[PDB]
Ligand binder design. Structure first.
Ligand SMILES: Cc1cc2nc3c(=O)[nH]c(=O)nc-3n(C[C@H](O)[C@H](O)[C@H](O)COP(=O)(O)O)c2cc1C
Ligand SMILES: Cc1cc2nc3c(=O)[nH]c(=O)nc-3n(C[C@H](O)[C@H](O)[C@H](O)COP(=O)(O)O)c2cc1C
Ligand SMILES: Cc1ncc(COP(=O)(O)O)c(C=O)c1O
Ligand SMILES: Cc1ncc(COP(=O)(O)O)c(C=O)c1O
Lengths: 214, 214
């Protein structure tokens, strides 16, 4: 029996490395640098990140969402408040975020608590979104099973007509979450599978920082 | 206060769509097609997937790993058996896998139970790995905190000398997991945030298939 073709897919990572002397006191400083370099390398969706949530049975779920804001208080993403992730977050606020920057031979993983954004900040953001996107927010009962795509298309045309030139109101079931920064791991690929790993861990007000074996 | 620059990063997805009539009876048939198209579009790491595990406190963790094999019995990846993920899996076998194919405006997410590969199949695979990688497997106590990178480099040279031309044995703490296929979601981006979503759910021997609102 021969190995599957994919068993042979592999790549040595020689773009760079990460040493303790390269680390800033604030993890967000390094994240900002990396994000900036991702935007410059021209990744298709530099702000795309995978958010993992856990349901009531201890089962993890994942889906990509976009990072739309970040500061010391956490990383932000917008979503339908009636969705599977939102319902999972309701019961277990613990989440994980992963920026899949492996084309740049890097990973950034964050652990923290997800909490709802205020209606106010959501409104601010909602009105900067493309008009068809605002309508679409109204159309989709995110995560719920639907009979066919026609249901969405029909509803979209219906709502577009209804909203005719006026402002599309913010649906009460559309909002977002702010994920606190409890831990942040940075990964930079290396050779011989000996990558660089540094984990920032919130310890009271400061950050405990350790290198983790690859 | 102006919105952060990233608040404005967004993309409309018009590469394609996914209709119920395009769905094969076996989800792996569609996954194979998509994977094939990812290898052709030349994604940097087409087999890279994000695996999420959950620790004993209900906290999710993520890290990328490579898909090295897959068939009806599940998807396979190799890793250090003493690592954080392996320890988390020990207590909670429930995992989630996500192929970040958003440059192709797609996502494939799998839910299932992670179980250990047999020593036998691991050996088979371990000996097809580059020699420096086999040594590296011995060097790194994956996930454990280490004092500095020098510790790894030193150990690597030490083991390389020790193994001098002979076969690098399979470390007892290096192996892999097979993730069963309980559910598999396919996502294909659309316009106005009205994407196509189909969830395959194992129901006894067959697959229950539903379109999920975007
Ligand atoms: C590149 C990309 C960006 C996405 N961004 C978001 C987002 O910011 N908010 C959102 O609700 N869904 C977003 N999605 C769709 C989600 O992946 C997911 O399908 C949806 O939120 C429903 O997940 P849920 O059923 O777990 O609640 C994005 C998908 C991709 C591939
Ligand atoms: C493109 C890419 C492929 C990777 N593949 C693997 C893999 O197949 N097995 C592995 O153990 N680690 C792999 N890693 C490293 C993991 O992301 C992770 O850092 C490591 O397994 C330790 O995770 P843990 O501490 O949660 O146990 C890969 C990283 C990247 C960015
Ligand atoms: C730590 C680690 N182990 C294994 C792999 C891939 O499996 P293999 O080295 O046999 O190609 C990777 C790929 O990035 C990795 O980072
Ligand atoms: C369902 C959904 N909501 C929101 C977003 C992105 O936020 P915004 O539409 O305001 O750019 C995406 C991006 O892909 C999405 O798929």
């Amino acid at each position: 029996d021969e190995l599957q073709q994919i068993a042979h897919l592999r790549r040595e990572y020689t773009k760079g490395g990460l040493r303790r002397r390269d680390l800033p006191a604030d993890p967000l400083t390094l994240f900002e640098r990396w994000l900036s370099q991702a935007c410059e390398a021209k990744l298709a969706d530099p702000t795309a990140m995978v958010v993992a949530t856990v349901d009531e049975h201890g089962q993890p779920y994942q889906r990509i969402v976009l990072l739309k804001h970040y500061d010391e208080k956490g990383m932000v993403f917008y979503t339908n408040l009636g969705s599977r992730k939102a319902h999972q977050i309701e019961n277990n606020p613990r989440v994980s975020l992963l920026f899949p920057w492996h084309t740049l031979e890097r990973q950034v993983m964050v652990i923290g608590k997800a909490e709802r954004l205020s209606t106010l900040e959501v409104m601010k953001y909602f009105h900067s979104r493309p008009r068809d996107s605002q309508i679409g927010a109204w159309v989709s009962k995110q995560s719920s099973r639907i009979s066919a795509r026609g249901i969405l298309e029909s509803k979209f045309l219906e709502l577009k007509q209804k909203f005719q030139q006026g402002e599309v109101p913010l649906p009460s079931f559309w909002g977002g979450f702010r994920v606190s920064l409890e831990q942040i791991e940075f990964w930079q690929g290396g050779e011989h599978r000996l990558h660089d790993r540094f984990l920032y861990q919130r310890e009271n007000d400061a950050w405990k920082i350790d290198r983790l074996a690859p």
